[PDB]
Amino acid sequence: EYLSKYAIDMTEQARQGKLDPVIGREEEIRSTIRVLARRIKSNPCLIGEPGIGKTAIIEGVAQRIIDDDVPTILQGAKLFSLDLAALTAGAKYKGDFEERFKGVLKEIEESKTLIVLFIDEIHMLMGNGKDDAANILKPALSRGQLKVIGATTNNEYRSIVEKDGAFERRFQKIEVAEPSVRQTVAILRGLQPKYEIHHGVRILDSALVTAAQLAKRYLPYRRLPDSALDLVDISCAGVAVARDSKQNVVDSDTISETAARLTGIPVKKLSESENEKLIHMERDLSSEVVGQMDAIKAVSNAVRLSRSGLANPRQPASFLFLGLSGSGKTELAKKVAGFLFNDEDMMIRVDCSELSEKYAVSKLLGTTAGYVGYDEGGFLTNQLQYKPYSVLLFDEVEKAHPDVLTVMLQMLDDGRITSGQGKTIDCSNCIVIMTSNLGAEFINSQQGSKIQESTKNLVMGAVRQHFRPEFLNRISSIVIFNKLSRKAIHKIVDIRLKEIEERFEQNDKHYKLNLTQEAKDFLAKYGYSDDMGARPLNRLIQNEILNKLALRILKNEIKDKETVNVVLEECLEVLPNHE
Amino acid sequence: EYLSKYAIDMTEQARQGKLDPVIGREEEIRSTIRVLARRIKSNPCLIGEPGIGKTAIIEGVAQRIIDDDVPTILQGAKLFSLDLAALTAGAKYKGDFEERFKGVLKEIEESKTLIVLFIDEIHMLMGNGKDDAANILKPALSRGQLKVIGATTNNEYRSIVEKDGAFERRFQKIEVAEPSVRQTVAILRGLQPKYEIHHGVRILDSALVTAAQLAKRYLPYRRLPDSALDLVDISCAGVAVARDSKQNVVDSDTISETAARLTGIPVKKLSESENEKLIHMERDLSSEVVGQMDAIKAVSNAVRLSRSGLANPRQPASFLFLGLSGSGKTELAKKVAGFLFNDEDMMIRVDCSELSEKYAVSKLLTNQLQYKPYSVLLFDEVEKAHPDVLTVMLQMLDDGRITSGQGKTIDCSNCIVIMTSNLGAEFINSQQGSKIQESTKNLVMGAVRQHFRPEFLNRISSIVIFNKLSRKAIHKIVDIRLKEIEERFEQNDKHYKLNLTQEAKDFLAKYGYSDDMGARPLNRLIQNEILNKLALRILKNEIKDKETVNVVLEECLEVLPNHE
Amino acid sequence: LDPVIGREEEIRSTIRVLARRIKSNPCLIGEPGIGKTAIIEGVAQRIIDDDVPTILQGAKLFSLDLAALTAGAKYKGDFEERFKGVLKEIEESKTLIVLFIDEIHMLMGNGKDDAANILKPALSRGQLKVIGATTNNEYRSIVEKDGAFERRFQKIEVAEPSVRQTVAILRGLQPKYEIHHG
Ligand SMILES: Nc1ncnc2c1ncn2[C@@H]1O[C@H](COP(=O)(O)OP(=O)(O)OP(O)(O)=S)[C@@H](O)[C@H]1O
Ligand SMILES: Nc1ncnc2c1ncn2[C@@H]1O[C@H](COP(=O)(O)OP(=O)(O)OP(O)(O)=S)[C@@H](O)[C@H]1O
Ligand SMILES: Nc1ncnc2c1ncn2[C@@H]1O[C@H](COP(=O)(O)OP(=O)(O)OP(O)(O)=S)[C@@H](O)[C@H]1O
Ligand SMILES: Nc1ncnc2c1ncn2[C@@H]1O[C@H](COP(=O)(O)OP(=O)(O)OP(O)(O)=S)[C@@H](O)[C@H]1O
Ligand SMILES: Nc1ncnc2c1ncn2[C@@H]1O[C@H](COP(=O)(O)OP(=O)(O)OP(O)(O)=S)[C@@H](O)[C@H]1O
């Protein structure tokens, strides 16, 4: 009775009502059955990603058996899901595994009606060229009943075929696609009463919907039927636990809180409508960055067109970050990544100074099958492949060899980008920011904080002259970045100093600073320039403040409630008297 | 009732007050409960690293069961731990624990309230495998029975799911955090009277505090619930032992001395001079490696910021050193280990220049960090390292989180990481005077960025560029090498003096020190004109001991009266 | 037994571990040829010299053979009859008896099974304190083969002595060589 130890009797579970209802797989079920109905090599295989409901297909078939919706020869069939891990774990000895596996094969061959197996990843039986995978579902499989329903990740299917041949002759492919968000919801709806019964809760129909939507957007590593169900089952658990600790599985709140825990994203104010309207990109970016904030509005306009659904779905929003050096080029770009995609980590930096004709494109997209390195994607596709909500920020684009720019422009128009290995990535949901300081030299004329037309058309003039015009025509907008007012520097300094307080995670220590005018002016004066940005402010704080503090901490000259010493250079004051 | 011998009613033990309160750990416990409440992937597993506090979590769970702070679906459930030891210890012959084990599960499955089992050693599924790889969990779970709370460390968990994907459908990966030292102290305070009773030694509250501080400082790869408690139990044993030999209290410094003697490293002997030398690290180092004032400054600042707790907390002192050969790139790395941990050996070599992921994964991810947790890691030619190496380095740079073994994290933010590259040599070799000059240094960063993404450059505490090792430095270096040569003489008879030491120095700097090889030529010239000639005079029995060296032009060894 | 030289702390710590409650059961772990047996020999001498804490003052230390099991399996289960005999006797009444196991990896048996009750119920209760020792590499083998031993035994890494310390050792043993060799 080896099947009683190594396999799950799916048929009896079906009979007992222990299997989930199956939604959206009728044809996969029919196909699985169709193959099983065959006389010879009746061995279908469910090929596709883990988490897409492949078990559901099997469970579906098991139910068909129970309800007698099965072809004659299969009506009396019993299904067993064979656990290959259980069979091999702890095997050690020469023929330990071999005996167990043969054991279940014999039980199948030995009279007890038709038994069909479900294999927990058929590719695991590749072996070291068979040999070690012996007779494990080999030739008997082709004729002597022993019908097997296999399953595998498609990539591994390919490997078992290429490294075996006979396997291909023995199995029939059935490909299984991942459900769409809507279909996912249909699945969730079919299963809704099972969750309500198990948890003892009420599930809003809309909860099922928002779970599926969040599943796609924030937990992409999982398949939709996997993720959405986890969101539902977890929220329901959440409600049951919290409720009972001292039933409304709310579509907004319980789904969001669960997602927050699973995604590492606070349950923010960022409802889709706020994001679509970008109300807060203006408000938050206005707070996060300084200078002429109307540049934000220009960006927001492009974004809203894509958010409205009116934009061509294949044309990612993009703009040219054209302007003054020192203006927080990457600060803004990171902050818009921050707000727009709800994470600064979405930013990808691409260095376009490193782009000679001979290799430029391959450096960004990766070299091809054969040449030095297969680290496909270099800078672009190897990040885009994981972060579809990323931002591509390109430094010094004006120096890029034109072929790169051509690839980039194609990446914007019907914006599917393919790596050097032929891996299509697709940039449709990405925001692209090309950047250039080409015109910074005109802005540097210092004609007030706001760029006047008298320089604006020199800044953009140079760009229009420099790039062949389609460069600009294929970009949603060109946004011009203005000069900081002295007050802008003061705000940056205040922000940075606050960052230092946070730097001190060990918040037993912090600054009071004092000299909030004199030290602030020392610092701000040293950083108030178009060719500086905060680079010197950062350096002064790292050195004149923190390295000097380290000396004072080490000498017990400073303990906490820390203050600054300015002679105008800068160091910190002694608080405890050399203790 | 096999369970009367093999199932421990953790719930009842909590009811009777047999289990300890646990530091606010409840937040994680609530996630355990939520998982048990689930329909799908209903078996949580407590996953972490030694000192995880796994049992403590379970004890907390048991207390919640007593409070019945659970969902209706889990309500009234009892938590029973399995006596895996007795079940298998009594396995006189094949089939004995197998039937007892299954017996217990079958009894657990019926009548005696809903039961969730706690299964420590969950990796046993891959050990007591074969039939048991299923019997232990699967058939029961296939009936909706036997919900369990499993537990193990990251190494095991990963191997379980890698070997058996069933666990990704049957279990939830409940990661467990290291507690705050404040929580650790709370643990220690709760245990304080137990320790007093155990040893007859009172523990000073500030001793409980320092144990947490010390443990985190010297054992980055062990969690506080293990290591801080060891410091207290060791120190208490220490005091008891001292008293057994000849108030009976553990002081903070008792524990400090324990840590020092326990590890051989004076973890808390932060004498004023420990901090003052840091103030003077740039000064002291300039006599250990010569000059290179800008490089030793970069190091000193990073170390001073790390030691003082000012460096971004997620940034171990860490450097990428650029320079020409003979610059002292290696020597500084060693002198930093010398200076900071009182031993130049407090470093770990990694052959980055020879890495490829297929093997780098085992060649790098090893146990050296378990023996020298404060070391200066020496990664040679990281520039040509496989991206896998570099990727793990990003994990390392982010608070020392080096992945090791089967998934064990080091967290050595108290270690120093030194990486080397010659990438910047492209412009360092401009040799524009002495100190790296304007333009050259910018070009160097341009060179650095050829292989070092912002991913590294904005995590490393400093990219450090060595200067042309100048003639001024050479005069001081010569003094060091001449000293070294005497030190080198393991055979005591080879004792010498340098006549005209200054002229020897002149020759070493003048006909030795190539501008392009740093101090290399000093080592070579001494050998070329001094040691070579000595070897002959030694073999010719001209020189025995207290020999001296002269200078002509051509170094001139003296000749002693015939060898004695 | 040669008069252990220089291992002052190692002995103190070995004993302190016996004095500890948590993982109160030390093993000397390290490179082969550094004196780990010498340290335990040192413990025996220190007990004899009455330079030890009262908890092991007058204690008796024994080195247990393979023969505890390898006396002969003739009679399946005799391995346990003998090992249990010994474990009981060691715990049995006669002041503190301390067990020395040289190359503790032998206790692993052929992958558990044969290991039977070797120190299983003993370690489980903090009884029969054992001072063990093994090659660092074997230590790692034990951690994988048994696991429980790592959770019960205290790991004490023992370092190689310096050249100067080595000279002190040689000096201390010098008369044994001079006498033996003439
Ligand atoms: N279409 C569906 N009908 C019924 N149940 C579903 C459906 N999709 C998902 N589920 C449930 O959600 C899970 C999806 O799991 P699957 O993708 O079948 O797991 P799997 O097929 O074993 O892949 P792995 O390798 O075990 S993740 C199942 O365990 C079902 O409980
Ligand atoms: N307009 C701004 N808003 C917010 N922060 C700014 C702004 N301008 C400069 N900064 C600061 O300057 C730093 C960001 O500089 P980056 O954008 O990387 O460099 P840059 O300012 O674009 O020009 P370069 O080429 O580095 S001089 C951050 O530390 C910001 O705090
Ligand atoms: N946070 C805590 N609060 C109260 N008691 C604790 C706490 N942490 C640990 N303890 C006590 O110390 C022990 C916890 O040890 P375990 O969790 O079994 O060891 P561990 O943390 O699992 O290390 P591993 O992984 O088994 S080597 C228990 O005996 C608890 O009573
Ligand atoms: N600043 C210095 N002070 C004293 N000795 C030095 C100094 N710089 C170099 N040396 C000598 O240079 C020798 C070896 O130099 P290293 O620093 O190893 O060469 P390097 O610069 O590290 O090049 P790599 O990449 O490590 S071969 C040492 O053994 C010292 O004798
Ligand atoms: N510190 C010491 N004092 C006295 N004798 C020592 C010392 N260190 C080593 N020895 C002698 O040198 C040998 C080292 O023996 P051991 O301690 O067994 O070696 P080990 O470290 O046990 O490696 P194994 O496992 O026994 S091969 C012994 O024969 C000791 O007599």
Tell me the CA distances in angstroms from A462 to A81, A283, A319, A467, B286, one per residue in order. Answer: 68, 32, 17, 9, 51
Nearest to A8 among B142, B279, B313 (CB): B142
Instruction: Report yes or no: A348 and A408 within 8 Å, Cβ to Cβ.
Output: no
Question: Both ends of chain B: CA-CA distance in Å?
Answer: 90
Inform me whether the C-beta atom of residue B248 falls under 8 Å from chain A C-beta atoms.
Answer: no
CA–CA separation, A417 and B159 (whole Å): 36
User: What is the DSSP code (8-state) at residue A53?
Assistant: S
Q: Taking CA A177 as the corner, what is the angle to CA A176 and CA A183, rounded to the nearest 5 degrees?
A: 125
The conformation of residue A303, written as its DSSP 8-state character, comes to: H
Which amino acid does the sequence have at A3? L
Tell which residue, A286, A250, A280, has the closest CA to residue A268. A280
* Pairing, β A477-481 against β A318-323: parallel
Residues of chain B contacting residue A505, judged by C-beta atoms under 8 Å apart: 313
From the list A385, A374, A394, A395, the residue with the least C-alpha distance to A416 is A385
- Rounded Cα distance, A521 and A514, in Å: 12
Q: CA dihedral in degrees (A420, A422, A423, A424; nearest 10)?
A: 110
Report yes or no: C141 and C15 within 8 Å, Cβ to Cβ.
Answer: no
Residue length, chain A? Answer: 579
The answer to whether residue B540 neighbours chain A at the CB level (below 8 Å) is: no
Residue pointed to by tokens 């991913």:
B455
Nearest to B50 by CA among B172, B220, B256: B220
Q: Which residue of C has its CA nearest to B263?
A: C157
Distance CA B151, CA B154 (A): 10
**Is C19 part of the contact surface with chain B (CB cutoff 8 Å)?**
yes
Spell out the SS3 assignment of A415-432.
Answer: CCCECCCCCECCCCCCEE
Where chain A is discontinuous (C–N > 2.5 Å), the residues before each break are 246, 568
Q: How far apart are CA B145 and CA B117, in angstroms?
A: 10
Beta-carbon neighbour count of residue B175 at 10 Å?
A: 13
Q: C135 — phi, psi (to 5°)?
A: -55, 130
Helices (H), A467-516: 470-473, 486-503
Q: Are strands B547-551 and B555-557 parallel, antiparallel or unpaired?
A: antiparallel
Alpha-carbon distance of A506 to B306, in angstroms, equals: 13
Mutate to test the interface with C, among B218, B241, B255 (most CBs of C within 10 A): B241
Task: Print the SS3 string covering B355-423.
Answer: CCHHHHHHHCCCHHHHCCCCCEEEECCHHHCCHHHHHHHHHHHCCCCCEECCCEECCCCCCEEEEECCC
How far is residue B542's CA from residue B259's CA, in Å, rounded to a whole number?
54
Contact criterion met (CB below 8 Å) for A90 and B126: yes
Q: Which residues of A are annotated as a binding site for ATP?
A: 48-55, 323-330
Contact C13 B244 (CB under 8 A): no
CB atoms within 10 A of CB A562: 21
Nearest to A189 by CA among A229, A133, A136: A229
SS3 B229: helix
d(CA A2, CA A396): 67
Mutation target to probe the B interface, by most B beta carbons within 10 A, among A347, A350, A351, A547 is A547
Proportion of chain B in helix, strand, coil states, percent, rounded to 5: 50, 15, 35
DSSP lists the bridge partners of residue B515 as none
CA–CA distance, B415 with A401 (Å, rounded to integer): 43
Ligand nearest to the CA of B518: 4
B237·C20 Cβ contact <8 A: yes
Establish how many alpha carbons lie within 13 A of residue A271's alpha carbon, considering only the half-sphere containing its beta carbon: 5
Residues A17, A154: one domain?
yes
DSSP 8-state symbol, B280 = T
Residue A464: which of A396, A398, A394 has the closest Cα? A398
DSSP conformation letters of B453-476: -HHHHTTSSEEEEPPP--HHHHHH
Residues B381 and B434 reside in one and the same domain? yes
Enumerate residues 6+ apart whose C-beta is below 8 A from B214: B228, B231, B255, B256, B259, B267, B268
AA letter at A280: H
Distance of CA C16 from the midpoint of ligand 5 (Å): 21
Tell me how far the alpha carbon of residue A403 is from its chain's centroid. Answer: 29
Residue B46: strand pairing partners? B151, B174
Rounded CA-CA distance A513/C152 in Å is 52
Any idea of the CA torsion for A143, A144, A149, A152, to the nearest 10 degrees? -70
* A89, A505, A547 member nearest B304 (Cβ): A547
Residue nearest to atom 29 of ligand 2 (CA): A534
Separation CA A397–CA A418 (nearest Å): 20
Together in a domain, A421 and A544: no
Which one-letter DSSP state was computed for residue B519? T
Contacts of B497 (CB under 8 A, 6+ apart): B546, B547, B548, B549
Q: How many CA atoms lie within 13 A of A20 on its CB side?
A: 24
Q: How far apart (Å, rounded) are the C-alpha atoms in residues B395 and B318?
A: 13
Q: Are residues B31 and B121 in the same domain?
A: yes
- Are A418 and A330 within one domain? yes
Strands A562-566 and B78-82: unpaired
* Ligand closest to the CA atom of residue B329: 4
Distance CA A271, CA B27 (A): 27
Both tokens assigned to A52 = 């897409």
Nearest protein CA to atom 7 of ligand 4, as residue: B328
Which is nearest to A475 in space by CA: A417, A426, A405, A425?
A405
- CA of residue B123 to ligand 3 center, whole Å: 18
Where residue B525 sits, what CATH number does that domain have? Answer: 1.10.8.60
CA gap C142, C103 in Å, rounded = 11
Quick one: which of B23, B61, B8 has its CA closest to B212? B23
Tokens in use for C59? Answer: 């204690």
Residue A450 and residue A311 share a domain: yes
Contact A96 B72 (CB under 8 A): no
3-state secondary structure (DSSP) of residue B439: coil
| Distance (Å, whole) CA C182 – CA C176 | 10
**Residue at A201: amino acid letter:** V
CA A566 – CA A519 distance, rounded (Å): 6
What is the CB < 6 Å shell around ligand 4? B 289-290, 292, 323, 325-331, 420, 469, 473, 477, 480, 518-520, 523
Q: Which residues contact A33 (CB under 8 A, 6 or more apart)?
A: A61, A64, A70, A71, A74
Interatomic CA distance for residues A66 and B129, integer angstroms: 32
Q: Which residue from B282, B319, B325 has its CB within 8 A of the most atoms of ligand 4, so it is best to mutate?
A: B325
Please judge whether C15 and B240 are an interchain contact, meaning their C-beta atoms are less than 8 angstroms apart.
Answer: no
Residue nearest to atom 12 of ligand 4 (CA): B326
**Amino acid at the residue A371:** Y
**Where in A18-162 does DSSP place strands (E)?**
44-47, 78-82, 115-119, 148-152
Nearest-by-CA chain B residue for A236: B38
**Residues pairing with A336 in the sheet:** none
User: Residue A226's closest CA among A162, A179, A261?
Assistant: A179
Taking the C-alpha atoms of residue C73 and residue A215, their distance in angstroms, rounded to an integer, is: 62
CA distances from C50 to B218, C26, C43, C54 (A): 34, 21, 11, 9
Q: Which domain holds residue A2?
A: 1-178
- d(Cα A331, Cα A481) in Å, to the nearest integer? 12
Which among B385, B381, B397 has a CA at the least distance from the CA of B361? B385
Q: Which two tokens stand for residue A152?
A: 């595998």
Residues 180-199 of B with CB under 8 A from C: 198-199
Do B476 and B535 lie in one domain? The reply is yes
From the list A13, A85, A234, the residue facing B163 with the nearest CB is A85
Judge contact between B63 and B191, C-beta under 8 A.
Answer: no
CB of B369 closer than 8 Å to CB of B402: yes
Phi then psi for C27, rounded to 5 degrees? Answer: -130, 140
**Distance between CA A215 and CA A235 in Å, rounded?**
13
> The domain that contains A72 carries what CATH number?
3.40.50.300
Q: How far apart are CA A230 and CA A211, in angstroms?
A: 9
Cβ–Cβ < 8 Å for B294, B463: no
B246–C contact, CB cutoff 8 A? no
CA nearest to A398, candidates A471, A466, A476, A329: A466
Residues A341 and A388: their CA atoms lie apart, in Å, by 10
Q: Which ligand is nearest to the CA of B520?
A: 4
Residue pair B467/B292 in contact by the 8 Å Cβ criterion: yes
For chains A and B, count residue pairs whose Cβ atoms are closer than 8 Å. Answer: 138
Query: Cα separations (Å) of A541 from A323, A522, A527, A559, B444?
Result: 27, 11, 11, 18, 24
Token pair, residue B380, equals 């040679």
Burial C136-173 (b: 16+ CB within 10 A, else e): bebbeebeebbbbbbebbbebbbeebeeeeeeebeeee
Helices (H) and strands (E) in chain B, counts: 27, 18
Question: In angstroms, rounded to a whole number, what is the distance separating the alpha carbons of residues A282 and A288?
Answer: 10
- Give dist(CA B220, CA B216) in Å, integer: 6
Do both B452 and B501 map to the same domain? no
Q: Is the CB of A407 under 6 A from ligand 1?
A: no
Name the nearest CA neighbour of B441 among B429, B458, B451, B456: B429
Per the CB < 8 Å rule, is C159 touching B264?
Answer: yes
Residue nearest to ligand 1 atom 31, measured at CA: A20
Which residues surround ligand 3 with Cβ inside 6 Å? B 20, 22-23, 25, 50-56, 153, 179, 187, 190, 225-226; C 151
Number of H helices, E strands in chain C: 8, 5
Do B302 and B433 reside in the same domain of the chain? Answer: yes
Query: For a substitution probing ligand 4, which of B331, B383, B418, B472 has the most ligand atoms within 8 Å of its CB?
Result: B331
For B550, the 3-state DSSP assignment is strand
Would you say A223 and A178 are in contact if contact means Cβ atoms under 8 Å apart? yes
Other Cβ atoms closer than 10 A to A380 = 27
**Distance separating alpha carbons of residues B556 and A562, to the nearest angstrom:** 61
Give the separation between CA A540 and CA A537, rounded to whole angstroms: 5
Residues 6+ apart with CB under 8 A from A70: A33, A61, A64, A77
Question: Is C115 a pocket residue for ligand 5 (Cβ < 6 Å)?
Answer: no
Asked whether the CA dihedral B422, B425, B428, B434 is positive or negative, the reply is positive
Q: Is A215 helix (H, G, I), strand (E, B) or coil?
A: helix
* A320 beta partners: A434, A478
- The whole-angstrom separation of Cα A217 and Cα A256 is 12
Question: Is residue B244 within a helix (H) or strand (E), and if so which, with residue range?
Answer: helix B224-245
Residue B74 Cα to ligand 1 middle (Å): 24
CA A254, chain centre distance (Å): 22
Which residues of chain A have a CB within 8 Å of the CB of B450? 354
Contact C28, C9 (CB under 8 A): no
Task: Judge contact between A157 and A123, C-beta under 8 A.
Answer: yes
| Residue B364 · residue B355 · CB < 8 Å | yes
End-to-end CA distance of chain C: give it in Å, rounded: 20
Q: What is the rounded CA–CA span in Å between residue A73 and residue A80?
A: 17
CA distance B12 to chain A (A): 20
Residues B40 and B152 in one domain: yes
Residue B479 and residue B458 share a domain = no
Tokens of A539: 């350096």
Give the strand pairing for B547-551 and A7-9: unpaired
Q: Measure the CA–CA gap between B269 and B284, rounded to whole angstroms.
A: 20
**Is the same domain home to A502 and A468?**
no
Residue C9 to residue B230, Cβ atoms within 8 A: no
Resolution of the experimental model, in Å, one decimal: 4.0
Report how far residue A245's alpha carbon sits from residue B318's, in angstroms, rounded to the nearest whole number: 48
Task: Count the Cβ atoms, other than its own, within 10 Å of residue B483.
Answer: 10
Token representation of residue A88: 């091999």
Q: Residue A381 is which amino acid?
A: T
- CB burial of B430-442 (b: ≥16 within 10 Å; e: otherwise) equals beeeeebeeebbe
Q: Which residues contact B72 (CB under 8 A, 6 or more apart)?
A: A200, A240, A244
Contact B477, B522 (CB under 8 A): yes
**Residue A15 contacts B, CB cutoff 8 Å:** no
Helix, strand, coil shares of chain C, percent, nearest 5, are 50, 15, 35
Q: Where are the alpha helices (DSSP H) in A367-485?
A: 381-384, 402-412, 440-443, 453-466, 470-473
B290 to A347, B286, B294, B323, B476: CA distances (angstroms): 42, 5, 11, 14, 7
Three-class DSSP category at A563: strand
For chain A, count helices (H), then strands (E): 26, 16
